[PDB]
Amino acid sequence: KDIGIDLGTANTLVFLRGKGIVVNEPSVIAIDSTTGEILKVGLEAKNMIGKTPATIKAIRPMRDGVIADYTVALVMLRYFINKAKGGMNLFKPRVVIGVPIGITDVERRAILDAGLEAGASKVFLIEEPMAAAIGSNLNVEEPSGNMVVDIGGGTTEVAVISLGSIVTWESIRIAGDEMDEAIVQYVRETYRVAIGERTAERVKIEIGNVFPSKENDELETTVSGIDLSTGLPRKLTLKGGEVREALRSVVVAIVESVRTTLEKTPPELVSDIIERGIFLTGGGSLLRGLDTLLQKETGISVIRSEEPLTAVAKGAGMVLDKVNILKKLQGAG
């Protein structure tokens, strides 16, 4: 039994060689604040965020693409592996876990340890964009310039793939989480209202956009929270234009990372990218008009992936059947 795991800062996906995606749940875990006992893991836990009594603590152990709260992350990972196997047993499956390219050796050691402690007989780490390319069948083993821009909840990764490896890359810790925060901050500074992270995510999903257009400007939705200047509950409406402005600095950072990667890419590979185009993927890349904006800024065609949410998990599991690539991945156990 072999599984691919996309342990995202926002959502976790597990691909089981033989049937596909068997786990797709928010990366949240809730525990009894006194006993430490796990109450819920997944969606039911996410639904608790910002709504818990003092007796319960809802946690998102993954941050910036890496482990931020070790033990909690450990038990959550075990829960997911157990669920992927279809209940806990004495079988230790082989596991491949996606990771940002800019990960440190220490952060890298933590994920390998966690994988083993969580119940894996052996763990392998695969770079995010590489897993996404394999999961989307991009023929990564060929000598063809393939630039992938993967935006998740914790990181934005830009990589030029060729011959089963990454030639050049940039990795910044500005992605989905920073988009949510940007909206929270915008509402607080503009209307003096405090809203939660989940309400900000809803806004991002319902009217988030990064390219100007009549249609985008007309988009609207409401948000509810507490007016910090009056101490009263308050509901107000946000429009596409406002949100686009709130996400400006984040988008600027993303565009910049793409330009910087292109600049240092070997000329023959750049030649390939101009003809092939840039591959845009990841849950954080779904902002309205993001492809439009990147294409206009780089002057190069941008293509959105067809399975932006599952590509990474699929690729992590599929890499097990590619000895040439697998043999180069760092592992443990």
TrEMBL record:
GO cellular component, as recorded: cytoplasm; cytoskeleton; plasma membrane
Record-linked CDD domains: ASKHA_NBD_MreB-like (cd10225)
Domain of life from the UniProt record: Bacteria
Residues binding ATP, per UniProt: T9, A10, N11, G153, G154, T155, E201, R202, V203, K204, G283, G284, S285, L286
InterPro entries according to UniProt: ATPase_NBD, MreB, MreB_MamK-like
Pfam family, one: MreB_Mbl
Main location: cytoplasm
Subcellular location: Cytoplasm
Presence of keyword Nucleotide-binding: yes
Stored Gene3D superfamilies: 3.30.420.40
One GO term (biological process): cell morphogenesis
Keywords: ATP-binding, Cell shape, Cytoplasm, Nucleotide-binding
An MF annotation (GO) of this entry: ATP binding
NCBIfam families from the UniProt entry: mreB, PRK13927.1
Subunit structure: Forms polymers.
Its biological purpose: Forms membrane-associated dynamic filaments that are essential for cell shape determination. Acts by regulating cell wall synthesis and cell elongation, and thus cell shape. A feedback loop between cell geometry and MreB localization may maintain elongated cell shape by targeting cell wall growth to regions of negative cell wall curvature.
Family membership noted in the UniProt record: Belongs to the FtsA/MreB family.
Protein name, as recorded: Cell shape-determining protein MreB
Organism: Thermotoga maritima (strain ATCC 43589 / DSM 3109 / JCM 10099 / NBRC 100826 / MSB8)
